[PDB]
Design an enzyme around this catalytic site. Structure first.
Site, PDB file in Angstrom:
ATOM      1  N   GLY A 125      35.983 -10.690  63.656  1.00  0.00           N
ATOM      2  CA  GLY A 125      35.699 -10.750  62.262  1.00  0.00           C
ATOM      3  C   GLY A 125      34.962 -11.962  61.548  1.00  0.00           C
ATOM      4  N   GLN A 126      35.452 -12.097  60.254  1.00  0.00           N
ATOM      5  CA  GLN A 126      35.055 -13.332  59.673  1.00  0.00           C
ATOM      6  C   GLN A 126      33.317 -13.638  59.311  1.00  0.00           C
ATOM      7  N   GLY A 127      33.076 -14.568  58.796  1.00  0.00           N
ATOM      8  CA  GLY A 127      31.524 -14.774  58.303  1.00  0.00           C
ATOM      9  C   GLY A 127      31.049 -13.540  57.151  1.00  0.00           C
ATOM     10  CB  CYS A 128      28.026 -14.276  55.163  1.00  0.00           C
ATOM     11  SG  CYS A 128      28.112 -16.193  55.200  1.00  0.00           S
ATOM     12  N   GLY A 141      29.399 -11.031  58.553  1.00  0.00           N
ATOM     13  CA  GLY A 141      29.796  -9.373  58.505  1.00  0.00           C
ATOM     14  C   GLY A 141      30.909  -9.101  59.539  1.00  0.00           C
ATOM     15  N   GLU A 142      31.025  -9.899  60.383  1.00  0.00           N
ATOM     16  CA  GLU A 142      31.795  -9.583  61.501  1.00  0.00           C
ATOM     17  C   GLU A 142      31.464 -10.009  63.024  1.00  0.00           C
ATOM     18  N   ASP A 161      21.017 -25.557  60.301  1.00  0.00           N
ATOM     19  CA  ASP A 161      22.457 -25.570  59.933  1.00  0.00           C
ATOM     20  C   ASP A 161      23.114 -25.949  61.419  1.00  0.00           C
ATOM     21  N   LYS A 178      27.200  -8.852  66.000  1.00  0.00           N
ATOM     22  CA  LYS A 178      27.401  -9.055  64.676  1.00  0.00           C
ATOM     23  C   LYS A 178      26.969  -8.065  63.794  1.00  0.00           C
TER      24      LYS A 178
HETATM   25  C1  LIG Z   1      33.606 -20.456  63.977  1.00  0.00           C
HETATM   26  C2  LIG Z   1      33.783 -19.287  63.808  1.00  0.00           C
HETATM   27  C3  LIG Z   1      32.661 -18.237  64.569  1.00  0.00           C
HETATM   28  O1  LIG Z   1      31.658 -18.091  64.008  1.00  0.00           O
HETATM   29  N1  LIG Z   1      32.933 -17.685  65.632  1.00  0.00           N
HETATM   30  C4  LIG Z   1      32.172 -17.064  66.521  1.00  0.00           C
HETATM   31  C5  LIG Z   1      32.604 -16.331  67.662  1.00  0.00           C
HETATM   32  C6  LIG Z   1      31.893 -15.665  68.383  1.00  0.00           C
HETATM   33  C7  LIG Z   1      30.643 -15.177  68.098  1.00  0.00           C
HETATM   34  N2  LIG Z   1      29.703 -14.297  68.817  1.00  0.00           N
HETATM   35  C8  LIG Z   1      28.615 -13.890  68.267  1.00  0.00           C
HETATM   36  N3  LIG Z   1      28.246 -14.410  67.200  1.00  0.00           N
HETATM   37  C9  LIG Z   1      28.695 -15.152  66.490  1.00  0.00           C
HETATM   38  N4  LIG Z   1      28.323 -15.476  65.062  1.00  0.00           N
HETATM   39  C10 LIG Z   1      27.166 -15.208  64.652  1.00  0.00           C
HETATM   40  C11 LIG Z   1      26.851 -15.731  63.248  1.00  0.00           C
HETATM   41  C12 LIG Z   1      25.586 -15.277  62.736  1.00  0.00           C
HETATM   42  C13 LIG Z   1      24.544 -14.554  63.252  1.00  0.00           C
HETATM   43  C14 LIG Z   1      24.764 -13.995  64.549  1.00  0.00           C
HETATM   44 BR1  LIG Z   1      23.539 -12.689  65.398  1.00  0.00          BR
HETATM   45  C15 LIG Z   1      25.956 -14.277  65.350  1.00  0.00           C
HETATM   46  C16 LIG Z   1      29.856 -15.571  66.976  1.00  0.00           C
HETATM   47  C17 LIG Z   1      30.822 -16.718  66.122  1.00  0.00           C
END
Ligand SMILES: */C=C\C(=O)Nc1ccc2ncnc(Nc3cccc(Br)c3)c2c1
Length: 245
Positions: free
Chosen positions: A17-20, A21-22, A116, A37
């Protein structure tokens, strides 16, 4: 008009979960464990390939999905603040720094800019394997770039030095007790975080090199990678372990 990264939605089958979609763990073509994602323009993820960058696997551009290698230990920020952070010592942290520098030296050679770089955008795998991910918050951002929009690999270097403090404090938010505006203003007047507790001066010197006013005087990632890899022979050979680092 899809490219050869396209897969069918049906090809994809547990939340994180979490983040601006999961972020789900999933299975791909019934055989392969992946991260999903749940914009686009990932076009950058297709052109980058290095062992310290998280690998693109596939995309669905119809209900969108971006599919990538699975990073068992989650993000580096959570990893550091978790159970396994009281056990981390400099050698493991310097090594994690090295893999990040190396991913970034690649990005540097490819003439890209991250924008970032921070512990929250690094993923961690088995065996303390770290890979740069997630392609702006002023505490991690260079002045010239928070103020005037001048993002370069040199501003990425700056963020790197901040990430260094994230590693050496076991994930503490930088400029502790300072608020965005106070950080902006104090950094403008030449303030820099001091040496973290138990952290060798020489590693702090490296942070300060990363935090020079003039970007061009900041080191390359190739330099940072090489210095980190060799740290315990060339720089701190009389290193003795302590209570935290
Ligand atoms: C610090 C929390 C976090 O972001 N954890 C996290 C764990 C696994 C993971 N797997 C794959 N992708 C992401 N994040 C992500 C963020 C923006 C774009 C994309 Br394509 C993937 C995470 C995040």
């Amino acid at each position: 008009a899809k490219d050869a990264w396209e897969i069918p939605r049906e090809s994809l089958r547990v939340k994180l979960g979490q983040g601006c979609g999961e972020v789900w763990m999933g299975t791909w073509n019934g055989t392969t464990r992946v991260a999903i994602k749940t914009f686009l323009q990932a076009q950058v993820m297709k052109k980058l390939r290095h062992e310290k960058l998280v690998q693109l696997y596939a995309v669905v551009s119809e209900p969108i999905y971006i599919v990538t290698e699975y990073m068992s230990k989650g993000c580096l920020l959570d990893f550091l603040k978790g159970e396994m952070g009281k056990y981390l010592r400099l050698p493991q942290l310097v090594d994690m720094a090295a893999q990040i520098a190396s991913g970034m030296a690649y990005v540097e050679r490819m003439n890209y800019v991250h924008r970032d770089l921070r512990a929250a955008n690094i993923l961690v795998g088995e065996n303390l394997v770290c890979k740069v991910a997630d392609f702006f918050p002023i505490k991690w951002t260079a002045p010239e770039a928070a103020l005037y929009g001048r993002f370069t690999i040199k501003s990425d270097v700056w963020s790197f030095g901040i990430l260094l403090t994230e590693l050496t404090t076991k994930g503490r938010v930088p400029y502790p007790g300072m608020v965005n505006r106070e950080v902006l203003d104090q950094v403008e007047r030449g303030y820099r975080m001091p040496c973290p507790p138990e952290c060798p001066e020489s590693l702090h010197d490296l942070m300060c090199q990363c935090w020079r006013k003039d970007p061009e005087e900041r080191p390359t990632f190739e330099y940072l990678q090489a210095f980190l890899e060799d740290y315990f022979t060339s720089t701190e050979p009389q290193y003795q372990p302590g209570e935290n680092l």
